[PDB]
């Protein structure tokens, strides 16, 4: 009955914007456009965003605000049989913490390394360099750039590790960076959404400041338009391929972040009559808009490199940490006042990660708080222990083979595990709880029922475009490999045990609670298909 609310409306929006706008808005989205043929990729992107992403984004925020509970208790009260969905979805966000946070650590690392007149990743004559170092990117894989060898042989020391079986020593300047990250995360989420709500005023807004600066600086570079060409030049031949639509689908779902239980928890602190439909639309737009803008930020510079640095666009156009920690710092180093751009760039990368991390962790805390009253009064002691667990396990990420640990989790911990949980999220609400009863809930809150367009998407379109796309992803599957290194198949098994441990909670709690309840079989179904106090 008694529950706290956001100290102000803006707190919520910035918490949702902050969480939804993450580093993948920067490295992955512009790359997908370039690879999939430019503005022609906006079509499948916009389509999957419209039918798949925003409805499910809308759905969680609605559920969260209505049921007024964390992800675990929410599904328990909604569909008691399916309460496992809340379990599955929460411990997914738990797995992501073991990897995603190290990206912020790297950002702070390049930040602390950015105080100097001359950026260390500029030249080839340092001690960590090999004979094969080249000034900038190229085709042949035996010969790296000065930025690549700086990232791998100095920051990571990944060259000292033969695989994920050999982690090697622990790097304490990285552990220190990772510790700093969890200190920031602690003193944010420590006292709850009271402090958290106002903290995100920085972490959500600051990247937009840096974006504008890097946009103008990027567009005033020679050859910037050449990059924009490669970025947006429409080629509609790529619309016909299957995995393009798979790419458009998986990006939209990771970007908007439904299925982590984050949107549920955040909305649970909303007042009942708040308009969550205006919020879902507003936030969804802002997130995609940021991705579109960042594209120009990346490719204006990517063009400048192609034109004045004598490199070819295919070699500098990248996704993942390769783009932000190697390719983009390479260009910054060349242009005048390099030290300034580097400093705001790595600070932007950090604040892009943090607000996302907050949501993931808040999704866990709020969910466990609502289940166990012992945690809520003890909350500061709980999150202290939780991050203690993160840092201790996270020390594996700070090793010399730490990247191999990162790359493993970066794949299996989330992704289509998220897709089957969200699939069940739509099926449970629409076909069990019912669309009529859900639409009635929203009418009580915001005063009007969802248009039938939204109902169709929740009931039909989203489950289909999930199920079909999550199936085509299993067919295009190939064993995890990084560069020349092929992960052992015992490593691939560990990844499935991680990916599976979440998903299997759907039938687990289903089978468990089913046998635990009294009577014959079909009043079981009814008893567990009945909502909380109905």
């Amino acid at each position, epitope marked *: 009955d008694e529950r706290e609310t956001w100290s102000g409306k803006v707190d919520f929006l910035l918490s949702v914007i902050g969480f939804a706008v993450d580093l993948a808005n920067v490295w992955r989205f512009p790359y997908l456009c370039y690879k999939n043929g430019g503005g022609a990729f906006l079509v499948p992107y916009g389509i999957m965003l419209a039918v798949g992403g925003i409805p499910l984004f809308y759905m969680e925020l609605a559920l969260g605000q209505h049921n007024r509970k964390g992800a675990i208790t929410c599904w328990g009260r909604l569909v008691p049989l399916f309460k496992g969905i809340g379990y599955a979805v929460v411990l997914i966000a738990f797995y992501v913490g073991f990897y995603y946070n190290v990206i912020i650590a790297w950002s702070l690392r390049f930040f602390f390394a950015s105080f100097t007149n001359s950026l260390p990743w500029t030249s080839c004559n340092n001690i960590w360099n090999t004979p094969n170092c080249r000034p900038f990117e190229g085709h042949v894989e035996g010969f790296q750039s000065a930025a690549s060898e700086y990232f791998n042989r100095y920051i990571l020391e990944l060259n000292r590790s033969e695989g994920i079986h050999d982690l090697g020593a622990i790097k304490w300047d990285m552990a220190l960076c990772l510790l700093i990250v969890y200190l920031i995360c602690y003193f944010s989420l420590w006292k709850g959404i009271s402090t958290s709500g106002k903290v995100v005023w920085f972490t959500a807004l600051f990247p937009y400041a840096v974006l504008l600066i890097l946009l103008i600086r990027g567009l005033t570079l020679p050859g910037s338009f050449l990059g924009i060409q490669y970025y947006l030049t429409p080629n509609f031949s790529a619309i016909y391929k299957a995995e393009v639509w798979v790419d458009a689908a998986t990006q939209v779902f990771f970007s908007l972040g439904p299925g982590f239980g984050v949107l549920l928890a955040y909305a649970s602190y909303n007042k009942y009559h708040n308009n969550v439909y205006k919020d879902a639309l507003l936030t969804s737009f802002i997130n995609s808009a940021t991705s579109f803008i960042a594209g120009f930020v990346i490719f204006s510079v990517l063009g400048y490199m192609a034109h004045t640095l004598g490199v070819r666009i295919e070699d500098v156009a990248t996704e993942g940490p390769g783009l932000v920690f190697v390719v983009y710092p390479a260009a910054i180093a060349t242009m005048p006042a390099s030290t300034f751009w580097a400093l705001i760039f790595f600070m932007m990368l950090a604040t892009l990660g943090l607000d996302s991390s907050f949501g993931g962790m808040e999704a866990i805390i709020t969910a466990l708080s609502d289940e166990f009253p012992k945690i809520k009064r003890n909350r500061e002691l709980f999150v202290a222990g939780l991050f203690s667990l993160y840092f201790v396990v996270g020390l594996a990420s700070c090793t010399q083979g730490g990247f191999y640990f990162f790359h493993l989790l970066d794949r299996y911990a989330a992704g289509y595990s998220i897709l089957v949980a969200v699939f069940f999220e739509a099926i449970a609400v629409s076909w069990i709880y019912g669309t009529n*009863r859900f*639409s009635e809930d929203i*009418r009580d809150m915001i*005063g*009007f*029922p969802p248009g039938r367009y939204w109902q169709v998407c929740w009931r039909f379109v989203a489950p289909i475009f999930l199920l079909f796309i999550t199936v085509y992803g299993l067919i295009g599957y190939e064993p995890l490999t990084y560069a020349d290194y092929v992960y052992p198949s015992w490593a691939n098994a560990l990844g499935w045990c991680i990916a599976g441990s979440s998903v299997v909670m759907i039938p687990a709690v289903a089978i468990f609670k089913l046998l635990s309840t009294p009577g014959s079989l079909r009043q079981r179904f009814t008893i567990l298909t009945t909502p909380w106090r109905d």
Partner: antibody
Amino acid sequence: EVQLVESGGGLVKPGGSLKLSCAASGFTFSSYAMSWVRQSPEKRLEWVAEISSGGRYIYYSDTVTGRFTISRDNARNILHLEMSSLRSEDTAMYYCARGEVRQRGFDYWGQGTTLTVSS
Amino acid sequence: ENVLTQSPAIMSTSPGEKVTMTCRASSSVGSSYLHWYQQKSGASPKLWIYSTSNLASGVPARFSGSGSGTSYSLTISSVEAEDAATYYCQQFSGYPLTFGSGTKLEMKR
């Protein structure tokens, strides 16, 4: 198209009880919220109660609260109002009105059925 | 409860003239949630204007409405004898739902 028809109502002695009905047709009845609005002999409109589309959300004015019960049948498309311990100030013409959207107001009204509470 | 007071109580108009009637709420009403109803003598009320500015289906363009907060109004540009009725405003912002005291519009001759 849409037709709302109120039935029941008439003379009832104070403290007595009576049940009002509203027959709906011309639309999917299960999709809309229903309310009762009454008009006193002094021609003042007063909202009585609201029932949601699935009947899971109910609201009453403090005047009729606990005495009046608004019910719903989506199968036969009939709205109900069950009054008890009736008083003279309950004398009015009772209206069946839809509906669902709060921001669009009540877009359809019935003919009304008159309740007289007197000894 | 949120009490809506309408003024004037009775109003007399020659055809072709313009009329304005006002609706004042004790508490504040969201603009989206305020509506008007026209009731002719011996008949049920009819939805007339919804969300303060928007004419209901069948309502002639001579009708218009405006307002915000605690103050709203209904205006007829050129009055017709067909427009003689009683007009009740309403707020749906919160429960209990309240109707204005009404403005009776009568023709003069």
